Amino acid sequence: MGSSHHHHHHSSGRENLYFQGHMAARITGEPSKKAVSDRLIGRKGVVMEAISPQNSGLVKVDGETWRATSGTVLDVGEEVSVKAIEGVKLVVEKLEEQKGS
């Protein structure tokens, strides 16, 4: 009980974030920075660090240095194609030469 029709105050100007959000489908989960861009998948990259099957190397895709793995041993200065992403590493294979001799 009570009730007051005295209105001299204005509405709005009140913000307060209730309910974080749970029991729903996880969308992305923290859309933060440095998120892997799939737009560079299927393009050429260059080998900056020697790549081995035991330890991934470093390739420069666009302008970013990524860890890259391969089934063969890749030396520096080579050109590779990024086929897929295995996680925090990229799946790359080396461009093929041609012996016209």
Side-chain angles (χ1 to χ4, degrees):
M1 291 180 63
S3 307
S4 185
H5 62 238
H6 197 102
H7 282 255
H8 189 245
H9 281 107
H10 71 272
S11 304
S12 305
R14 295 177 174 164
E15 62 168 281
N16 189 26
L17 292 75
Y18 283 112
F19 181 73
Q20 298 180 89
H22 68 159
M23 297 177 62
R26 184 197 68 146
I27 304 175
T28 307
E30 289 191 84
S32 192
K33 60 190 300 179
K34 195 182 67 178
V36 186
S37 309
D38 61 302
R39 52 171 50 176
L40 48 79
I41 302 305
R43 274 190 157 146
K44 184 194 297 183
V46 62
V47 185
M48 294 273 68
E49 184 67 287
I51 301 175
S52 55
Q54 298 178 270
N55 181 264
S56 313
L58 294 179
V59 295
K60 179 172 177 292
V61 185
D62 181 87
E64 311 309 296
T65 320
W66 297 95
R67 285 75 154 185
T69 331
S70 193
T72 331
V73 183
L74 309 180
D75 194 76
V76 181
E78 288 305 305
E79 304 184 278
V80 294
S81 302
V82 186
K83 288 189 183 302
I85 313 175
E86 60 180 297
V88 297
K89 303 175 295 177
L90 301 181
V91 182
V92 301
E93 296 187 69
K94 207 185 78 63
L95 270 66
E96 59 285 270
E97 317 82 70
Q98 63 294 93
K99 30 74 174 297
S101 304

Coordinates of all heavy atoms in Angstrom, one line a residue:
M1 N 0.8 -1.2 0.0 CA 0.0 0.0 0.0 C 0.9 1.2 0.0 O 2.1 1.2 0.3 CB -0.9 0.0 1.2 CG -2.0 -1.0 1.2 SD -3.1 -1.0 2.6 CE -3.8 0.6 2.4
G2 N 0.2 2.4 -0.3 CA 1.0 3.6 -0.4 C 0.4 4.5 -1.5 O -0.5 5.3 -1.3
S3 N 1.0 4.4 -2.7 CA 0.6 5.0 -3.9 C 0.8 6.5 -3.8 O 0.4 7.2 -2.9 CB -0.9 4.7 -4.1 OG -1.2 3.3 -4.1
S4 N 1.5 7.0 -4.8 CA 1.7 8.4 -5.0 C 1.7 8.8 -6.5 O 2.5 8.3 -7.3 CB 3.1 8.8 -4.3 OG 3.3 10.2 -4.4
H5 N 0.9 9.8 -6.8 CA 0.8 10.2 -8.2 C 1.6 11.5 -8.4 O 1.5 12.1 -9.5 CB -0.7 10.5 -8.6 CG -1.4 11.5 -7.9 ND1 -2.6 11.3 -7.2 CD2 -1.1 12.9 -7.7 CE1 -3.0 12.4 -6.6 NE2 -2.1 13.4 -6.9
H6 N 2.5 11.8 -7.5 CA 3.4 13.0 -7.6 C 4.5 12.7 -8.6 O 5.4 11.9 -8.3 CB 3.9 13.4 -6.2 CG 4.4 14.8 -6.2 ND1 3.8 15.8 -5.7 CD2 5.6 15.3 -6.7 CE1 4.5 16.9 -5.8 NE2 5.6 16.6 -6.4
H7 N 4.4 13.3 -9.7 CA 5.4 13.1 -10.8 C 6.1 14.4 -11.2 O 5.5 15.2 -11.9 CB 4.8 12.5 -12.0 CG 4.5 11.0 -11.9 ND1 5.3 10.1 -12.6 CD2 3.6 10.3 -11.3 CE1 4.8 8.9 -12.3 NE2 3.8 9.0 -11.5
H8 N 7.3 14.6 -10.6 CA 8.1 15.7 -11.1 C 9.5 15.2 -11.6 O 10.2 15.9 -12.2 CB 8.3 16.7 -9.9 CG 9.0 18.0 -10.4 ND1 10.3 18.4 -9.9 CD2 8.6 18.9 -11.2 CE1 10.6 19.5 -10.5 NE2 9.6 19.9 -11.3
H9 N 9.8 13.9 -11.3 CA 11.0 13.3 -11.7 C 10.7 12.7 -13.1 O 9.6 12.4 -13.5 CB 11.4 12.2 -10.8 CG 12.1 12.7 -9.6 ND1 11.6 12.7 -8.3 CD2 13.4 13.2 -9.4 CE1 12.5 13.2 -7.4 NE2 13.6 13.5 -8.1
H10 N 11.8 12.6 -13.9 CA 11.7 12.1 -15.3 C 12.2 10.6 -15.3 O 13.0 10.2 -14.4 CB 12.5 12.9 -16.2 CG 14.0 12.8 -16.1 ND1 14.7 13.6 -15.3 CD2 14.9 12.1 -16.8 CE1 16.0 13.3 -15.4 NE2 16.1 12.4 -16.3
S11 N 11.7 9.9 -16.3 CA 12.1 8.5 -16.4 C 13.4 8.3 -17.1 O 14.0 9.3 -17.6 CB 11.0 7.7 -17.2 OG 9.7 7.9 -16.5
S12 N 13.9 7.1 -17.2 CA 15.3 6.8 -17.8 C 16.4 7.4 -16.9 O 16.1 8.0 -15.8 CB 15.3 7.4 -19.2 OG 14.3 6.9 -20.0
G13 N 17.6 7.1 -17.3 CA 18.8 7.6 -16.5 C 19.1 6.5 -15.4 O 19.8 6.8 -14.5
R14 N 18.6 5.3 -15.6 CA 18.8 4.2 -14.7 C 19.3 3.0 -15.5 O 18.5 2.4 -16.2 CB 17.6 3.9 -13.9 CG 17.1 5.0 -13.0 CD 15.8 4.7 -12.3 NE 15.5 5.7 -11.3 CZ 14.2 5.9 -10.8 NH1 13.2 5.0 -11.1 NH2 14.0 6.8 -9.9
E15 N 20.6 2.7 -15.4 CA 21.1 1.4 -16.0 C 21.7 0.6 -14.9 O 22.4 1.0 -14.0 CB 22.1 1.8 -17.1 CG 23.3 2.5 -16.6 CD 24.5 2.6 -17.6 OE1 25.2 1.6 -17.7 OE2 24.6 3.6 -18.2
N16 N 21.5 -0.7 -15.0 CA 22.0 -1.7 -14.1 C 22.0 -3.1 -14.7 O 20.9 -3.7 -14.8 CB 21.3 -1.6 -12.7 CG 21.9 -2.5 -11.6 OD1 23.2 -2.7 -11.7 ND2 21.2 -2.9 -10.7
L17 N 23.1 -3.7 -15.0 CA 23.2 -4.9 -15.7 C 22.9 -6.1 -14.7 O 23.8 -6.5 -13.9 CB 24.6 -5.1 -16.3 CG 24.8 -4.1 -17.5 CD1 25.1 -2.7 -17.0 CD2 26.0 -4.7 -18.4
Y18 N 21.7 -6.7 -14.9 CA 21.4 -7.9 -14.2 C 21.5 -9.1 -15.1 O 21.4 -8.9 -16.3 CB 19.9 -7.8 -13.7 CG 19.7 -7.0 -12.4 CD1 19.0 -5.8 -12.4 CD2 20.2 -7.4 -11.2 CE1 18.8 -5.1 -11.3 CE2 20.0 -6.7 -10.0 CZ 19.3 -5.5 -10.1 OH 19.1 -4.8 -8.9
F19 N 21.7 -10.3 -14.5 CA 21.8 -11.5 -15.3 C 22.9 -11.5 -16.3 O 22.8 -10.9 -17.4 CB 20.4 -11.8 -16.0 CG 20.4 -13.1 -16.8 CD1 20.3 -14.3 -16.1 CD2 20.4 -13.0 -18.2 CE1 20.3 -15.5 -16.8 CE2 20.4 -14.2 -18.9 CZ 20.3 -15.4 -18.2
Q20 N 24.0 -12.2 -16.0 CA 25.2 -12.3 -16.9 C 24.8 -13.0 -18.1 O 24.9 -12.5 -19.2 CB 26.3 -13.0 -16.2 CG 26.8 -12.3 -14.9 CD 28.0 -13.1 -14.3 OE1 29.1 -12.9 -14.6 NE2 27.6 -14.0 -13.4
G21 N 24.2 -14.2 -18.0 CA 23.9 -15.1 -19.1 C 24.4 -16.5 -18.9 O 25.6 -16.7 -18.9
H22 N 23.5 -17.4 -18.8 CA 23.9 -18.8 -18.6 C 22.8 -19.7 -19.1 O 21.7 -19.2 -19.4 CB 24.3 -19.1 -17.2 CG 23.2 -19.1 -16.2 ND1 23.3 -19.7 -15.0 CD2 22.0 -18.4 -16.2 CE1 22.2 -19.5 -14.3 NE2 21.4 -18.7 -15.0
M23 N 23.0 -21.0 -19.2 CA 22.0 -22.0 -19.6 C 21.6 -21.8 -21.0 O 20.5 -22.1 -21.5 CB 20.8 -22.0 -18.7 CG 21.1 -22.3 -17.2 SD 19.6 -22.2 -16.2 CE 18.5 -23.4 -16.9
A24 N 22.6 -21.2 -21.8 CA 22.3 -21.0 -23.2 C 23.5 -21.6 -24.1 O 24.4 -22.2 -23.5 CB 22.2 -19.5 -23.5
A25 N 23.4 -21.4 -25.4 CA 24.4 -21.9 -26.3 C 25.6 -20.9 -26.4 O 25.4 -19.7 -26.6 CB 23.8 -22.1 -27.7
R26 N 26.8 -21.4 -26.1 CA 28.0 -20.6 -26.2 C 28.3 -20.1 -27.6 O 28.6 -20.9 -28.5 CB 29.2 -21.4 -25.7 CG 30.5 -20.6 -25.6 CD 31.7 -21.4 -25.5 NE 32.0 -22.2 -26.7 CZ 33.2 -22.5 -27.2 NH1 34.3 -22.1 -26.5 NH2 33.3 -23.2 -28.3
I27 N 28.2 -18.8 -27.7 CA 28.5 -18.2 -29.0 C 29.9 -17.6 -28.9 O 30.1 -16.5 -28.3 CB 27.5 -17.1 -29.4 CG1 26.1 -17.7 -29.4 CG2 27.9 -16.5 -30.7 CD1 25.0 -16.6 -29.6
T28 N 30.9 -18.3 -29.5 CA 32.3 -17.8 -29.6 C 33.0 -17.9 -28.3 O 34.0 -18.6 -28.2 CB 32.4 -16.3 -30.1 OG1 31.7 -16.2 -31.3 CG2 33.8 -15.9 -30.3
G29 N 32.5 -17.3 -27.2 CA 33.1 -17.3 -25.9 C 34.3 -16.3 -25.9 O 35.4 -16.6 -26.2
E30 N 33.9 -15.0 -25.5 CA 34.9 -13.9 -25.4 C 35.4 -13.6 -26.8 O 36.4 -14.1 -27.3 CB 36.1 -14.2 -24.5 CG 35.7 -14.2 -23.0 CD 37.0 -14.2 -22.2 OE1 37.6 -13.1 -22.0 OE2 37.4 -15.3 -21.7
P31 N 34.6 -12.8 -27.6 CA 35.0 -12.3 -28.9 C 36.1 -11.3 -28.7 O 35.9 -10.0 -28.9 CB 33.8 -11.7 -29.5 CG 32.7 -12.0 -28.6 CD 33.3 -12.3 -27.2
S32 N 37.4 -11.7 -28.5 CA 38.5 -10.8 -28.1 C 39.3 -10.6 -29.4 O 38.9 -10.9 -30.5 CB 39.3 -11.4 -27.0 OG 40.2 -10.5 -26.4
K33 N 40.5 -10.1 -29.1 CA 41.4 -9.7 -30.2 C 42.4 -10.9 -30.5 O 42.4 -11.9 -29.8 CB 42.3 -8.5 -29.8 CG 43.1 -8.7 -28.5 CD 43.7 -7.4 -28.0 CE 44.6 -6.8 -29.1 NZ 45.2 -5.5 -28.6
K34 N 43.1 -10.8 -31.6 CA 44.0 -11.8 -32.1 C 43.3 -13.1 -32.4 O 43.9 -14.2 -32.4 CB 45.1 -12.0 -31.0 CG 46.3 -12.7 -31.5 CD 47.4 -13.0 -30.4 CE 46.9 -13.9 -29.4 NZ 47.9 -14.2 -28.3
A35 N 42.1 -13.0 -32.8 CA 41.3 -14.2 -33.2 C 41.7 -14.6 -34.6 O 41.8 -13.8 -35.5 CB 39.8 -13.9 -33.2
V36 N 42.0 -15.9 -34.8 CA 42.5 -16.5 -36.0 C 41.5 -16.1 -37.2 O 40.3 -16.4 -37.1 CB 42.6 -18.0 -36.0 CG1 43.3 -18.5 -37.3 CG2 43.5 -18.4 -34.8
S37 N 42.0 -15.5 -38.2 CA 41.2 -15.2 -39.4 C 41.3 -16.3 -40.4 O 42.4 -16.7 -40.9 CB 41.7 -13.9 -40.0 OG 41.8 -12.9 -39.0
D38 N 40.1 -16.8 -40.8 CA 40.1 -17.9 -41.8 C 40.2 -17.4 -43.2 O 40.3 -18.2 -44.2 CB 38.7 -18.7 -41.6 CG 37.5 -17.8 -41.9 OD1 37.4 -16.8 -41.2 OD2 36.7 -18.1 -42.8
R39 N 40.2 -16.1 -43.4 CA 40.3 -15.5 -44.7 C 41.7 -15.7 -45.3 O 41.9 -15.5 -46.5 CB 40.0 -14.0 -44.6 CG 40.8 -13.3 -43.6 CD 40.7 -11.7 -43.7 NE 39.3 -11.3 -43.7 CZ 38.9 -10.1 -43.8 NH1 39.7 -9.1 -43.6 NH2 37.6 -9.8 -43.9
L40 N 42.7 -16.1 -44.5 CA 44.0 -16.4 -45.0 C 44.2 -17.8 -45.3 O 45.3 -18.2 -45.7 CB 45.1 -15.8 -44.0 CG 44.9 -16.2 -42.5 CD1 45.4 -17.6 -42.3 CD2 45.6 -15.2 -41.6
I41 N 43.2 -18.6 -45.1 CA 43.3 -20.1 -45.3 C 43.1 -20.4 -46.8 O 42.0 -20.0 -47.3 CB 42.3 -20.9 -44.4 CG1 42.5 -20.6 -43.0 CG2 42.4 -22.4 -44.7 CD1 44.0 -20.9 -42.5
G42 N 44.1 -21.0 -47.4 CA 44.0 -21.3 -48.8 C 44.9 -20.4 -49.6 O 44.8 -20.4 -50.9
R43 N 45.7 -19.6 -49.0 CA 46.6 -18.7 -49.6 C 48.0 -19.1 -49.4 O 48.3 -20.0 -48.6 CB 46.3 -17.2 -49.2 CG 45.3 -16.5 -50.1 CD 45.2 -15.1 -49.8 NE 44.6 -14.3 -50.9 CZ 43.8 -13.2 -50.8 NH1 43.6 -12.7 -49.6 NH2 43.4 -12.6 -51.9
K44 N 48.9 -18.4 -50.1 CA 50.4 -18.7 -50.0 C 51.0 -18.0 -48.7 O 50.6 -16.9 -48.3 CB 51.1 -18.2 -51.2 CG 52.6 -18.5 -51.2 CD 53.3 -17.7 -52.3 CE 52.8 -18.0 -53.7 NZ 53.6 -17.3 -54.7
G45 N 51.9 -18.7 -48.2 CA 52.7 -18.2 -47.1 C 54.2 -18.5 -47.3 O 54.6 -19.3 -48.1
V46 N 55.0 -17.8 -46.6 CA 56.5 -17.9 -46.7 C 57.1 -18.5 -45.4 O 56.6 -18.2 -44.3 CB 57.2 -16.6 -47.1 CG1 57.0 -15.6 -46.0 CG2 58.7 -16.8 -47.3
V47 N 58.1 -19.4 -45.6 CA 58.7 -20.0 -44.4 C 59.8 -19.1 -43.9 O 60.8 -18.8 -44.6 CB 59.3 -21.4 -44.8 CG1 59.8 -22.1 -43.6 CG2 58.2 -22.3 -45.5
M48 N 59.7 -18.8 -42.6 CA 60.7 -17.9 -42.0 C 61.6 -18.8 -41.0 O 62.8 -18.5 -40.8 CB 60.0 -16.8 -41.2 CG 59.3 -15.8 -42.1 SD 60.4 -14.4 -42.7 CE 61.5 -15.3 -43.8
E49 N 61.0 -19.8 -40.5 CA 61.7 -20.7 -39.6 C 61.6 -22.2 -40.1 O 60.5 -22.5 -40.6 CB 61.3 -20.6 -38.2 CG 62.0 -21.5 -37.2 CD 63.5 -21.0 -37.0 OE1 64.3 -21.2 -38.0 OE2 63.8 -20.4 -36.0
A50 N 62.6 -23.0 -40.1 CA 62.6 -24.3 -40.6 C 61.5 -25.1 -39.9 O 61.3 -25.2 -38.7 CB 64.0 -25.0 -40.3
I51 N 60.7 -25.8 -40.8 CA 59.6 -26.6 -40.3 C 59.9 -28.1 -40.3 O 60.4 -28.6 -41.4 CB 58.3 -26.3 -41.2 CG1 58.0 -24.9 -41.1 CG2 57.2 -27.2 -40.7 CD1 56.8 -24.5 -42.1
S52 N 59.6 -28.8 -39.2 CA 59.8 -30.2 -39.2 C 58.6 -30.9 -38.7 O 57.7 -30.3 -38.2 CB 61.0 -30.5 -38.3 OG 60.9 -30.0 -37.0
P53 N 58.5 -32.2 -38.9 CA 57.3 -33.0 -38.4 C 57.3 -33.2 -36.9 O 56.3 -33.6 -36.3 CB 57.5 -34.3 -39.2 CG 58.9 -34.5 -39.5 CD 59.5 -33.1 -39.5
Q54 N 58.5 -33.0 -36.3 CA 58.6 -33.2 -34.9 C 58.3 -31.9 -34.1 O 57.8 -31.9 -33.0 CB 60.0 -33.6 -34.5 CG 60.4 -35.0 -35.1 CD 61.8 -35.4 -34.8 OE1 62.7 -35.1 -35.5 NE2 62.0 -36.1 -33.7
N55 N 58.7 -30.7 -34.8 CA 58.5 -29.4 -34.2 C 58.1 -28.4 -35.3 O 58.8 -28.3 -36.3 CB 59.7 -29.0 -33.5 CG 59.6 -27.6 -32.8 OD1 60.0 -26.6 -33.4 ND2 59.1 -27.6 -31.6
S56 N 57.0 -27.8 -35.1 CA 56.4 -26.8 -36.0 C 57.3 -25.6 -36.2 O 58.1 -25.2 -35.3 CB 55.0 -26.3 -35.6 OG 54.2 -27.4 -35.2
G57 N 57.3 -25.0 -37.4 CA 58.1 -23.9 -37.7 C 57.3 -22.6 -37.7 O 56.2 -22.6 -37.3
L58 N 57.9 -21.6 -38.4 CA 57.3 -20.3 -38.4 C 57.1 -19.8 -39.8 O 58.0 -19.7 -40.6 CB 58.1 -19.2 -37.6 CG 58.2 -19.5 -36.1 CD1 59.1 -18.4 -35.5 CD2 56.8 -19.5 -35.5
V59 N 55.8 -19.5 -40.2 CA 55.5 -19.0 -41.5 C 54.9 -17.6 -41.4 O 54.2 -17.3 -40.4 CB 54.6 -19.9 -42.3 CG1 55.3 -21.2 -42.6 CG2 53.3 -20.1 -41.6
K60 N 55.2 -16.8 -42.3 CA 54.6 -15.4 -42.3 C 53.4 -15.4 -43.3 O 53.6 -15.3 -44.5 CB 55.6 -14.4 -42.7 CG 55.1 -13.0 -42.7 CD 56.2 -11.9 -42.9 CE 55.7 -10.5 -43.0 NZ 54.9 -10.3 -44.3
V61 N 52.2 -15.4 -42.7 CA 51.0 -15.4 -43.5 C 50.4 -13.9 -43.5 O 50.1 -13.4 -42.4 CB 49.9 -16.4 -43.0 CG1 48.7 -16.3 -43.9 CG2 50.5 -17.8 -42.9
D62 N 50.4 -13.3 -44.6 CA 50.0 -11.9 -44.8 C 51.0 -11.0 -44.1 O 52.0 -10.5 -44.7 CB 48.6 -11.6 -44.2 CG 48.1 -10.2 -44.3 OD1 47.6 -9.8 -45.3 OD2 48.4 -9.4 -43.3
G63 N 50.9 -10.9 -42.8 CA 51.9 -10.1 -42.0 C 52.1 -10.7 -40.6 O 52.8 -10.1 -39.8
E64 N 51.5 -11.8 -40.4 CA 51.5 -12.4 -39.0 C 52.4 -13.7 -39.1 O 52.4 -14.4 -40.1 CB 50.1 -12.8 -38.6 CG 49.1 -11.7 -38.7 CD 49.5 -10.4 -38.1 OE1 49.7 -10.4 -36.9 OE2 49.7 -9.4 -38.9
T65 N 53.2 -13.9 -38.0 CA 54.0 -15.0 -37.9 C 53.2 -16.1 -37.2 O 52.9 -16.0 -36.0 CB 55.3 -14.7 -37.1 OG1 55.8 -13.4 -37.5 CG2 56.4 -15.8 -37.4
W66 N 53.0 -17.2 -37.9 CA 52.2 -18.3 -37.3 C 53.0 -19.6 -37.2 O 54.0 -19.8 -38.0 CB 51.0 -18.6 -38.2 CG 50.0 -17.5 -38.3 CD1 49.9 -16.6 -39.3 CD2 48.9 -17.3 -37.4 NE1 48.9 -15.7 -39.0 CE2 48.2 -16.1 -37.9 CE3 48.5 -17.9 -36.2 CZ2 47.1 -15.6 -37.2 CZ3 47.4 -17.3 -35.6 CH2 46.7 -16.2 -36.1
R67 N 52.7 -20.4 -36.2 CA 53.3 -21.7 -36.2 C 52.7 -22.6 -37.2 O 51.5 -22.7 -37.4 CB 53.1 -22.4 -34.8 CG 54.0 -21.8 -33.7 CD 53.5 -20.4 -33.2 NE 53.9 -20.2 -31.8 CZ 53.5 -19.1 -31.2 NH1 52.8 -18.1 -31.7 NH2 53.9 -19.0 -29.9
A68 N 53.5 -23.3 -38.0 CA 53.1 -24.2 -39.0 C 53.7 -25.5 -39.0 O 54.9 -25.6 -38.7 CB 53.3 -23.5 -40.4
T69 N 53.0 -26.5 -39.3 CA 53.5 -27.9 -39.3 C 53.3 -28.5 -40.7 O 52.5 -28.0 -41.5 CB 52.7 -28.8 -38.3 OG1 52.3 -28.0 -37.2 CG2 53.6 -29.9 -37.7
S70 N 54.1 -29.5 -41.0 CA 54.0 -30.2 -42.2 C 54.5 -31.6 -42.1 O 55.1 -32.0 -41.1 CB 54.9 -29.4 -43.3 OG 54.6 -29.9 -44.6
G71 N 54.3 -32.4 -43.1 CA 54.8 -33.8 -43.1 C 56.2 -33.9 -43.6 O 56.9 -35.0 -43.5
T72 N 56.7 -32.9 -44.2 CA 58.1 -32.8 -44.8 C 58.9 -31.7 -44.1 O 58.3 -30.9 -43.4 CB 58.0 -32.6 -46.3 OG1 56.8 -33.1 -46.8 CG2 59.2 -33.2 -47.0
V73 N 60.2 -31.8 -44.3 CA 61.1 -30.7 -43.7 C 61.2 -29.5 -44.7 O 61.6 -29.7 -45.8 CB 62.5 -31.3 -43.5 CG1 63.4 -30.3 -42.8 CG2 62.4 -32.6 -42.6
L74 N 60.7 -28.4 -44.2 CA 60.7 -27.2 -45.0 C 61.8 -26.2 -44.6 O 61.9 -26.0 -43.4 CB 59.3 -26.5 -44.9 CG 58.1 -27.5 -45.2 CD1 56.8 -26.7 -45.1 CD2 58.3 -28.1 -46.5
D75 N 62.5 -25.7 -45.5 CA 63.6 -24.7 -45.2 C 63.1 -23.3 -45.3 O 62.0 -23.1 -45.7 CB 64.8 -25.0 -46.1 CG 66.1 -24.3 -45.6 OD1 66.7 -24.8 -44.7 OD2 66.4 -23.2 -46.2
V76 N 64.0 -22.4 -44.9 CA 63.6 -21.0 -44.9 C 63.6 -20.4 -46.3 O 64.5 -20.7 -47.1 CB 64.5 -20.2 -44.0 CG1 64.1 -18.7 -43.9 CG2 64.5 -20.8 -42.6
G77 N 62.7 -19.5 -46.6 CA 62.6 -18.8 -47.9 C 61.7 -19.6 -48.9 O 61.4 -19.1 -50.0
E78 N 61.2 -20.7 -48.4 CA 60.2 -21.5 -49.2 C 58.9 -20.9 -49.2 O 58.5 -20.0 -48.4 CB 60.2 -22.9 -48.7 CG 61.4 -23.7 -49.0 CD 61.7 -23.7 -50.5 OE1 60.9 -24.1 -51.3 OE2 62.9 -23.4 -50.8
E79 N 58.0 -21.3 -50.1 CA 56.6 -20.9 -50.2 C 55.7 -22.1 -49.9 O 55.9 -23.1 -50.5 CB 56.4 -20.4 -51.6 CG 57.3 -19.2 -52.1 CD 56.9 -18.7 -53.4 OE1 57.3 -19.2 -54.4 OE2 56.2 -17.6 -53.4
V80 N 54.8 -21.9 -49.0 CA 53.9 -22.9 -48.6 C 52.4 -22.5 -48.8 O 52.1 -21.3 -48.8 CB 54.1 -23.4 -47.2 CG1 55.4 -24.0 -47.0 CG2 53.9 -22.2 -46.2
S81 N 51.5 -23.4 -48.9 CA 50.1 -23.2 -49.0 C 49.5 -23.6 -47.7 O 49.6 -24.8 -47.3 CB 49.5 -23.9 -50.2 OG 50.1 -23.5 -51.4
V82 N 48.7 -22.7 -47.1 CA 48.0 -23.1 -45.8 C 46.7 -23.8 -46.2 O 45.8 -23.2 -46.7 CB 47.7 -21.8 -45.0 CG1 47.1 -22.2 -43.7 CG2 49.0 -20.9 -44.8
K83 N 46.6 -25.1 -45.8 CA 45.5 -25.9 -46.2 C 44.4 -25.9 -45.1 O 43.2 -25.8 -45.4 CB 46.0 -27.3 -46.4 CG 46.7 -27.5 -47.7 CD 46.9 -28.9 -48.0 CE 47.8 -29.1 -49.3 NZ 47.1 -28.5 -50.5
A84 N 44.9 -25.9 -43.8 CA 43.9 -26.0 -42.7 C 44.5 -25.5 -41.4 O 45.7 -25.2 -41.4 CB 43.4 -27.4 -42.6
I85 N 43.7 -25.5 -40.4 CA 44.2 -25.1 -39.0 C 44.0 -26.3 -38.1 O 42.9 -26.8 -37.9 CB 43.4 -23.9 -38.5 CG1 43.2 -22.8 -39.6 CG2 44.0 -23.4 -37.2 CD1 42.4 -21.7 -39.1
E86 N 45.1 -26.7 -37.4 CA 45.0 -27.9 -36.5 C 44.8 -27.4 -35.1 O 44.9 -28.3 -34.2 CB 46.3 -28.7 -36.7 CG 47.6 -28.0 -36.4 CD 48.8 -28.8 -36.6 OE1 48.9 -29.8 -35.8 OE2 49.6 -28.5 -37.4
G87 N 44.6 -26.1 -34.9 CA 44.5 -25.6 -33.6 C 45.2 -24.3 -33.4 O 44.7 -23.3 -34.0
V88 N 46.3 -24.3 -32.7 CA 47.1 -23.0 -32.6 C 48.2 -23.1 -33.6 O 49.0 -22.2 -33.7 CB 47.7 -22.9 -31.2 CG1 46.6 -22.8 -30.1 CG2 48.6 -24.1 -30.8
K89 N 48.2 -24.1 -34.4 CA 49.2 -24.3 -35.5 C 48.5 -24.4 -36.8 O 47.3 -24.7 -36.9 CB 50.0 -25.5 -35.3 CG 50.7 -25.6 -33.9 CD 51.4 -26.9 -33.7 CE 50.4 -28.1 -33.6 NZ 51.1 -29.4 -33.4
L90 N 49.2 -24.1 -37.9 CA 48.6 -24.2 -39.2 C 49.1 -25.4 -40.0 O 50.3 -25.8 -39.7 CB 48.9 -22.9 -40.1 CG 48.4 -21.6 -39.5 CD1 48.8 -20.5 -40.4 CD2 46.9 -21.7 -39.3
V91 N 48.3 -26.0 -40.8 CA 48.7 -27.1 -41.6 C 49.1 -26.6 -43.0 O 48.2 -26.2 -43.8 CB 47.5 -28.1 -41.8 CG1 48.0 -29.3 -42.6 CG2 47.0 -28.6 -40.4
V92 N 50.4 -26.7 -43.3 CA 50.9 -26.1 -44.5 C 51.7 -27.2 -45.3 O 52.3 -28.1 -44.7 CB 51.7 -24.9 -44.3 CG1 50.9 -23.8 -43.6 CG2 53.0 -25.2 -43.5
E93 N 51.8 -27.0 -46.6 CA 52.6 -27.8 -47.4 C 53.3 -27.0 -48.4 O 52.8 -25.9 -48.8 CB 51.9 -29.0 -48.1 CG 51.3 -30.0 -47.2 CD 50.7 -31.2 -47.9 OE1 51.4 -32.0 -48.5 OE2 49.4 -31.3 -47.9
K94 N 54.5 -27.4 -48.9 CA 55.3 -26.6 -49.7 C 54.9 -26.6 -51.2 O 54.5 -27.7 -51.7 CB 56.8 -27.0 -49.6 CG 57.8 -25.9 -49.8 CD 59.2 -26.4 -49.8 CE 59.5 -27.1 -51.1 NZ 59.5 -26.2 -52.3
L95 N 54.9 -25.5 -51.8 CA 54.7 -25.4 -53.3 C 55.7 -26.3 -54.0 O 56.9 -26.4 -53.5 CB 54.9 -23.9 -53.7 CG 53.6 -23.1 -53.7 CD1 53.1 -22.9 -52.3 CD2 53.8 -21.8 -54.4
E96 N 55.3 -26.8 -55.1 CA 56.2 -27.8 -55.8 C 56.9 -27.1 -57.0 O 56.3 -26.3 -57.7 CB 55.3 -29.0 -56.3 CG 54.2 -28.6 -57.2 CD 53.0 -28.0 -56.5 OE1 52.1 -28.8 -56.1 OE2 52.9 -26.8 -56.4
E97 N 58.1 -27.5 -57.1 CA 58.9 -27.0 -58.3 C 58.7 -27.9 -59.5 O 58.0 -28.9 -59.4 CB 60.4 -26.9 -57.9 CG 60.7 -26.4 -56.5 CD 60.6 -27.4 -55.4 OE1 61.4 -28.3 -55.4 OE2 59.6 -27.3 -54.6
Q98 N 59.4 -27.5 -60.6 CA 59.4 -28.4 -61.8 C 60.7 -28.4 -62.4 O 61.3 -27.4 -62.7 CB 58.3 -27.9 -62.8 CG 58.5 -26.5 -63.4 CD 58.4 -25.4 -62.3 OE1 59.4 -25.0 -61.7 NE2 57.2 -24.9 -62.1
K99 N 61.3 -29.6 -62.6 CA 62.6 -29.8 -63.2 C 62.5 -29.9 -64.7 O 62.4 -31.0 -65.3 CB 63.4 -30.9 -62.6 CG 62.5 -32.1 -62.0 CD 61.9 -32.9 -63.2 CE 61.2 -34.2 -62.6 NZ 62.1 -35.1 -61.9
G100 N 62.5 -28.8 -65.4 CA 62.5 -28.8 -66.9 C 63.9 -29.0 -67.4 O 64.5 -28.0 -67.9
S101 N 64.4 -30.2 -67.3 CA 65.8 -30.5 -67.8 C 65.8 -31.9 -68.5 O 65.9 -31.9 -69.7 CB 66.8 -30.4 -66.7 OG 66.7 -29.2 -66.1

